[model samples]
Structures are given as C-alpha cells and as structure tokens.
Target: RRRIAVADPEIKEYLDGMLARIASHRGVEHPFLNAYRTTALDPEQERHLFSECYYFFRYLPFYITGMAVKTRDEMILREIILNVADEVGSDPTHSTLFADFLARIGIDKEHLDGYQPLEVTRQLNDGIRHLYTETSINKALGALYADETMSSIMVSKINDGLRNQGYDDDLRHFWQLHNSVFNAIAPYVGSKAARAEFEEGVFEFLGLVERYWDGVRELVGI
Candidate 1:
C-alpha cells in the first residue's frame, strides 16, 4: 500500500472545505441541502450521463496500465491495476439509472453499445493517456489521487443530497458504490506518497493532479 504523507493539517482542511463548497454549488435550491438533487437530469435524461460514465470506465484500463508500466514499485503498480480492474469488472450494469433512462429514451442497451465517444470524451481520454503513459508514476498517481478523492467527496454530497430529497436507495446507489471504492483507494494512494523515493517527483505529481481536475472541469463544462 502506498500513502502520501501530510505534514500540514491546514492543507487538508482547506481542500475538504473547498470540495464541499464546489459540490454544494453544483446543486439546486439550498446549495447545502439540495446539492445532490437530481435537478440536472430526470430519470428519463439519464442516458447521456450513463453513457458518459460508461465511456469513462472503459478508458480506465488504458490510464491504469500506463501508470502500472512506469511505476518503480512493481507490487504497488500491480495492486493499483488489480484494484482498478476489480472496479471495472464489478459493475457489469454500468449505470443503472442511466440504463433505465436509455430505455425511456428509446435507446436500449444495444443502442448504448453503439454509442461512440464524443469530442470532449476523446479530449479527456487523451489527457489521461498522456499523463499515465508519458509522465512518471509519481505524477500519474498524483493525478489519480486528486481525481479519486475529489470524486469521493463530490459523490458523497450527491448521495446525501439525494437522500435528503426523498429519493430511494436505488437512485442513491450510484453515488454510494463509488464513495465506497474511492474511500478504500484514497488512503492507499496516500500511503504510497510517503514511501515514494523521489521528492521532486512528488511535487510534480501534485501539479499534474491539479491539472487533471482542470481537464475534468473542461470535459464536464463545469
């Protein structure tokens, strides 16, 4: 297990607060209470979101493999890859609501199967590929850490908000599953950081992590 050391509580606190604020802002009505409300997409509108999420998952192997190849620690690389593979394999249904939405939109699973990646998807995929394939493992892990942890936080808000809005467990399961997985992987990534041999690479990795979020924002039009 790899973990990043944190000497400063202030940075962690600041990041936590920042993520909360962002998740809140992305919601409707009371930003804090209604943050996870499914206002952006009704049940019928889930196809687009589901398709996008599916595409994202399909691309993970490419990104993880890139990191695995460059990693100095063979065990860590193998573990990370296996963990990611497990995630990808566990969810054969992809997005359940998205699947339902696809049916509503007259786009069944077969239709979704034929759905191609859009330009934004391509750009996001390309960015991840460049980071994992060309960059050092430290940098790649940094990007992974930022994206995964932020997702954990954001999805938690969404899940909580949905519960608050009187949604059923079925709707909230999407956020729930991811929150669980990211929670497990986050500490491992942090541990790896502490064991990393190259300090400069660590800092560079953080920089790339920040850039990965920027890429995400661009992809999502956020």
Candidate 2:
C-alpha cells in the first residue's frame, strides 16, 4: 500500500500554520456554509445548492488535468493522477456519485449539466481554472491544497445536513472519504519564494470562494 505521510514534518507544520490562518477567512466560515450544514433545505434550495456544485465539479477534473500536464515532477504528477483517479477514474466516479445523489433529489445528469451557474459560481470556477491552468506549479499546488482542505472540512458537515433531511447512506456516498492531500505538495513548499506564491494562490481562491457563497446565499434567499 502507498504510504500516507508528509515528506517533511517541518514543512507540514508550516503548511498547517498557513492553512490555520486561512481558516479564519470567510471562505471557510461563511454563513451559507453554516446554514447549509445546520438547516434542512427546501426543494428549490436543494436544487440550487447541488446544481451549482455539480457545475463546478463537472469542470474540476479538466482543470486538474491542466495542472497535471504543467508539472514534470514525478511525485507531484503521481499525486495529481491519483487525485484525478479518485475524482473521475475510479468506478462510479465522484461526479457520477454526485449525480446519483442529485437524482435522488429528482435531478438527472442532463438537468444538472444544463444548470446555468450564477455569476459568483462562474467566478469561483474561473479562479480555480486560472490557478490550475495559468499560474505557476507552486501556486497551483497551493490552490489545490486549499481546495482539498476546504472540501474535507465541509463534506462531512454537509453530509450531516443531508442526513437530517432524510438522505440515507447510499445517497450520501458522494460526501464520504474526503481528506486533504497536503502531503502531495508539502515538499515543494519548503522555500520562502515557494511559500509566498503558494500562499497567494490559496488566499486568492479563498476570497473567490467566499464571494461564491454570498452569491449562493442570495440565490437561496437565506
């Protein structure tokens, strides 16, 4: 089995410190997330929530592939590939599982695919896309770290809310097994310049995410 540990403990500590600072940002502690994780959503609310999410996830693998092709480092390549596998290569891909969850709520693949994302949703997607496709590998990896970290923290909470809304285990499978993949990029972040670039990408993405949630809150009227 592949070992799951950071290459450098000190670097891991540094990374954790940065993420902790970012944790205080509204992106991670948004009102929309708070309500979504705590309240039971009505039908229209559910549709809006998942539809916007599905639109984002649908393009994520492609953006990740952009990151993969930009990197020549074998370790980082392997990590990105593994991540993409979990997302789209595995049996019943994560997106597929999400579609299944949406179907349980009465949304089919075509319906979700046709969703017109709100302006802030597009902004969030574009921000991630730029990082993965246009930014330096150091910055891109930093953004990846932020994305994985946020998802891990949010998935279980969101799943809990869904459970309260009567969703069973099978319906909630899409939210299972999420965790940060910080180890994948930890080694590259040891230097000062690398850390600065990485931190910029992380914070920029977080700001975009915060605004995205505000948009969602407005759409859901909560």
Candidate 3:
C-alpha cells in the first residue's frame, strides 16, 4: 500500500473556497455577530466563557494521543505531534498573546489560573480521548485538520475585527501567529482529505467551531 502524503493541488482550491466562505460570513452583517450582539450576558456569563475557553485546552491531550496512536508511522506521528505543539505550546508569543488578550478583557493570570473546567468541556475532552484511543489515525487527523484549517480563517477575521476596533499589536498577535501557522498547514491537510469523508468532517468540525465561538461570546459578554 502506498503511504498517503499530506499535499494535493485540487484540494487546495477547495480549502481556499472554504476559507473564503468563512471570511465572507465573518463580515459585519454576519448572523454570528448579530447573535453575539443581541445576546445579553452578565459578569457571571462572561466568566463562564473564560472558564470554558481555558478549559478547552484540556482537549489537546486527546488530539495528541489520537495522532500519536493512529498513525502507522511512529516517526511521522511524532513529527506531527511536535509540530502541533510547537504551533501552540512552544511559541511563547502565542501564549502571551492570549494571556494578554484575556487580561485586557479583565481576566488576569491569577484569575485564569484559578479557573476550573466546565462539565461540558470535560465531557467533550473525555469523548475525544476515547475516540483517539479507538479510532484510526486518519479519522483523528481528519478532526485535527478541520480544527486547525478552520481556525486559520476564523482567527483571521477575528484579528481583522480586533484591529478595526483599535486593539494594540501585542493583543492582536494571537491571530497573527495563528494565521501564519494555519496558512502553512491548511493546504497540506486539505490535500489529504478524502472527498466523501472531508465534507462530513468539515461539518462536524464546524459544529465544534460554533461551540467554541459560543463559549467566547459567553465569556466576553459581547
């Protein structure tokens, strides 16, 4: 059997279309913005959002484990895992970008440090853990690809909005860094997608994406 490499020219166009769609929807008239604006949230609601966002990190272990176990090639899997970690964890700037953003929004390091994971986040994390432990690496890669690729577009819009809102460069670094990472990898992942399976995974991933944004809206009281 041939080993599947992560790169395809045709799929690259499709992924670009997907990114464009996401960007188009992120414009001011987008329904998500409307929902966020109309949604009335108090301080408690805001705190819940922060808690959920903080707790979301717990899901990373499951993804890492899944990728580690599912890949037939241990070396490739290890490299992918390391790349993923480097994308988020090894980058000090990425850490500070988020911490600073939270602080600007009134969530200090001490407050964030004290936060507990919400039940929903915990449950989702557990589910991913179980899935990674049992499912094929291809399946797990599908999920990771969806998550990372989608964020590239979504975060771009968010950062664009943040800049428009007059946020400083330091606080906007989260999007900047993520954009660089995602753009580099999205095409590679997109090429790896099986056409039939790709759409299903994308939709499922979009649902998860909505949940994340909902958590953000809940946190910021916006």
Candidate 4:
C-alpha cells in the first residue's frame, strides 16, 4: 500500500532481469517481428490480427482504472475522457480507436469488437480483472507494467506493418495513444516489492497475447 522510491534496491536489482524477460517475447525476435513487418499478409492473416485485437485491446480500461485507484481517481477520469474522445466518431462517450484501424483494413468494427474472445484471452483478462476491487491500489497497478512497456516496444513495429501495407499516420494513432497514456502512469508505481509481481507477470501476460496470436496464426493457415 505504500510507495517505493524509484531507487529502492528491491526494485533496482530486478530491473535488468525484467528487461531481459521482455526481450525474449516473440514481438522482439526475428520471425515474429517478420510477421508484423511483412507486407504480404493475406486478407485472412490481416483480419485475424484485427479480430483478435478485441482481447489485445483490453489494456486501456484496466490500466486507467488501476492507476486511478493509486490516488488519481478523478485524474484518471479526466485522461480517459479526453483520450477516448479522439477515437469516438463524434460520439463523445463511446468509441474504439483500434476498431477504426480494423475498418481501414476493410474489417467491420462490429466483427472485430464483437468477436468472442478465445479461452486464453478470456482466461487472461479474468486473471487480472480484479484490479478494480483490489485493496492495495499500487499492487494492482503492477499489472500494467507489462503492457505499458511492451506496447511501447511493439507500437512502432505495428505502425511499420501498417505503413508497409500503405496505411497512413492518421490511422496509426491507435497504438500510439495507448503508448502515451498508459506509460504516463509509470512514475507512480508505488510498491517496488509487490509491483515486481506485475513486472514478473508482464512476461506471462504478454505471452497470453502471443497465445491468442498463435491461435489466429493457425486459423489463417500460418
């Protein structure tokens, strides 16, 4: 429940270990990086990416809620409103920016957003969904370290993939928005000891996203 200083030895020691754990994800390696950067994605491969995104996209709400609980309830509220506003199609209160990215690739938002999450996706969110009710707010915010750092790593590549296929910057802001917003909360990591749990959790957390992508790969005949 208490805040840990950034320089706390408990945290500093594991920071490099956490970085190595992250570098091991498929997103950073050759073949996986190839998958996102390649220009030859067939329609099915592309759709699978967008469709599976419904689950991949859950980071926003969970992160906003977690950070808010860490002492910025109204502060988180304001960022959520202002950030989501740009994604909404003139509908102030509801919209999905990633859904728009799907539309750019000719996928329907309803199909992408409404697609039933596979068990892995469902299980993954179920595992972390308690952030909203967790008694120790800082502990819950640790759940975000994985996505916050990884998204920043992958967003540029995702944008590269989009551009390789001719998508423009206007449509590329979806991931960029998350990269900016979620990371903005990074400084408030209050529990170096417990936050390490999420720092550790981030590896498995991202693996779950890859797990969904693996399912998609098979569906697309990867």
Candidate 5:
C-alpha cells in the first residue's frame, strides 16, 4: 500500500480514533497489568513470569528485522531499522539489559537461553512472528504500534512494582529503556481498506497478548 502523507485528513482522524481505542487497553487498565501490580509473586513465580517474557522478547529483534525486509518504502524501512538499532545495536543493548534483569533475579543466561516457552507463550510469539512475516506491511506496523504503545505504560508499572519488591534500578533498566513508539505509521494508512487492515493487526495481536497473559496469571498464581 502507498504511504499517506501525515498532513492528509485521513491520517489525522485515524490517529485520534486509534488513540482512543488504545486508551481502553493501555497500562494498568489491562487485566494482566492490574494483577501484576496488585499481587506479590514469590521467587519461583517471578522466575516463571520473566522466563516467559524472555522466551517471547528474545524474538523481538528478529521480528523487527523480518518486518524491515518486507518493505521497500524508505520511510518505513528506516523506522523499522531505527527500532532495531535501539533494540539490538545500542550499547548495553535491550537484550543485554533484560539479561541483567534476569540475572539480578537469579536466572543466569544459560538458564534463560535454554528455557522453552510454555504453549501459550509460544503461541504469542508465533502470532507476533506471523504478523511480521505474512501480513501486510501496514498491518505489521499496526501490531508494532500496539506493542510499543502498551508496553511503554505496562513496563513502567512493572518497574515500579519490582522496585517495591526490593529490586534496584540496575535490574530494572530493561523496562526503563523500552519506551519505543510507532504511531508514525498512522499517516501511512491512505485508504479505508488500509485502516481496517491496520486495526485487524492491532486487535488480533492484543487478543493473543490477552491469551498469553491468562496463562501467565494462572502459572504465577495471580
């Protein structure tokens, strides 16, 4: 699909409406976020939660790369790679930051890398990967938007909760560093059809996220 210029009326309305939709699910409002904030998980449960997180988030850079290869548009490609640069190329890379967090919680790199995802976690990863590889570029971008927007809020909540649990900033750096946003993709939705495809990506990924979190809540006894 051709990219719509940001000044177009179509983009303005689309972004406002999309933000309203996102507000419904953002931050501590989401069930998993609320539960995670309110409940104090034991050491084993914390391990369970972050282990599932490690399994899925480890695929994150690959997802951005996969999405990058699908687009020839210079703007979109640059945006995708910038996210990759932040995620994998930065000093004390996002992956490394997460490793440090896991280590602080007593999970070594060997244990994290060797861990297998439970079925729900695997499903969420596969769902996200499918969006990156098989969907329209706009749709993939929409999914990225959902992830980045919601994560900015949720990760902060997690950081605060972890701090209350006695974890230090050094161990919580990953969450602090994850404030990425991709709403610029809104202007690229030039047509009604494109807008619908983008919304499908957002809602579908959100559904998968909810399902994955359901399993996490159960596994962690939240």
Candidate 6:
C-alpha cells in the first residue's frame, strides 16, 4: 500500500489548518465546498479544469526556471531545467507533448493562445512568482515543493476519476507525468533553510486549490 500519511511536522500543521479552510471555505469556497464535495462534475466542466491545469504547467515552470537560472546553484538549476523542459512539452520535442495532449481531448495550442486563467489562478500565479522573485531561493523551492506535492495527490485522483468514467489514457498521461515528476523532486530538497518556506509555500498553494476547486464547483452548479 502507498504511504498516505504526511509525517512531517510542518506539513502536518498545514494540513490540519487546511481542514479548517475546507470546512468553512471562507475564500472561494467559503460557503460552497460543502456542496462541492457532493457534486458530480460533467465533461465540459472537467475540460475547463484541464485548461486550468494546462495554465499551471504553461506558466509555472517558466517563472521558477527563470529564477533558477540566476540562482547560480547548479543542482537546483539542473533540477528545475528538467521540470521546465517537461512543461514546455516533453518527450517528442520541446513544444508538442502538452500541446498534443490538449489536442487529444479536442483543444489545441492555437486555441490556448487566447486562454485566460481564472482570477484565482492568476492569484496563484502571482503568489508563486512573488515567492520565486521576492523571497530567498530556499523559500521558492519550498513553495514549489508544496505546489508539486499537492499536484501529486490531485493528479492521481484525477486519473482515478478518469478511468472510472472510461476516459482515454491520453488525458491520464498528463496527470501521471505530473505525479511522477513532482514526487521525484520531493525527497531531494532536504534542508533546514526550507522549513519555514515550505510551510508558507504549502499554505499558499493549498489556498489556491480551494479557490480553483470552487471554480470547478461553478461548472457543476454546486
């Protein structure tokens, strides 16, 4: 069986705090997540969500990798380069994998040209960029770790839901890639400097997930 519990004190604290946020949902879900949990999301609704996920992969690595390039830390830079390359489109080339994934489900990179992420996604974006540019490198890593770890769980369940609904493996591949890649980096960033940064980073990303899911709630009318 896979290990499900978070044993880290810092992470445990954040998750414990997260329960309160999900319970009351004062931000985006403030008064709705209670309904959201029970709602059944439709295909188109899930597409919008896939789009949002694309937006995350589309822009997130650029900010981190760009900052990483300047950090003068070869190991960190190397770690993030693979991440950035994967985001820009991996495997066959540097611009096809993700674009192709989007197309497989009926959207295209050309269509993505006009894509505008939700207000809260932008909030998530701003928060990430601030962490990378305004805070220490260690803090930025902490924030990125939080987001990736969250993606690990979120994407895996998305895959499960996909298979449950008889969706194709193409869509599932994207989630799988995220889960594996993010999880691979998690254990590599062990340093005391990241203790607080990791805490703050996760808090921010978790807040973003609540807001993001509430938007998903809008599609289901929950």
Model 3, residue pairs in steric clash: 49-219
Tell me which of candidates 5 and 6 scores higher on TM-score.
5
Winner of 2 and 6 under TM-score: 2
At residue 57, what lDDT does model 5 achieve?
79
| Error of model 2, residue 19, in angstroms | 3.0
Q: Which stretches of candidate 5 lie over 4 Å from their true place?
A: 1-4, 26-28, 179-184
Off-target runs (Cα >4 Å) in candidate 3 are 1-30, 33-51, 58-62, 74-79, 88-93, 116-120, 123-133, 179-200, 215-222
Residue-by-residue lDDT tens digits, candidate 4, 161-196 = 877877777877675554233333334443566555
Task: Give the per-residue Cα lDDT of candidate 1 at 98.
Answer: 46
Q: Candidate 5 on 192-221: residue-level lDDT in tens?
A: 788888888888888788778778778888
lDDT for 78 in candidate 1 is 57
Expressed as tens digits, the lDDT of each residue in 1-222 for candidate 1 is: 323423344435533553454334332112332323444544433445446545654555656676766656655565566656655556554444445634644567787678875555555556666766776564565455444444566566557645664667765566677633233234333433532522233334334334433443344331
lDDT of each: 0.49, 0.79, 0.53, 0.56, 0.75, 0.57
Q: Tens-digit lDDT track for model 3 on 161-218?
A: 5565566777667667763333433433443345335444444445554555554554
* Candidate with best lDDT: 2
Model 4 ranges with Cα > 4 A deviation: 1-4, 7-10, 27-30, 62-95, 131-139, 176-200
RMSD to truth, every model: 7.4, 3.5, 5.7, 5.0, 2.7, 7.1
As a whole number from 0 to 100, the lDDT of residue 64 in candidate 3 is 59
Candidate structures ordered by lDDT, highest first:
2, 5, 6, 4, 3, 1
Residue 145 in model 1: lDDT: 48
Better of 1 and 6 by lDDT: 6
Higher-lDDT candidate among 2 and 3? 2
lDDT of 1: 0.49
TM-score of 3: 0.61
220, model 6: CA deviation in Å? 3.9
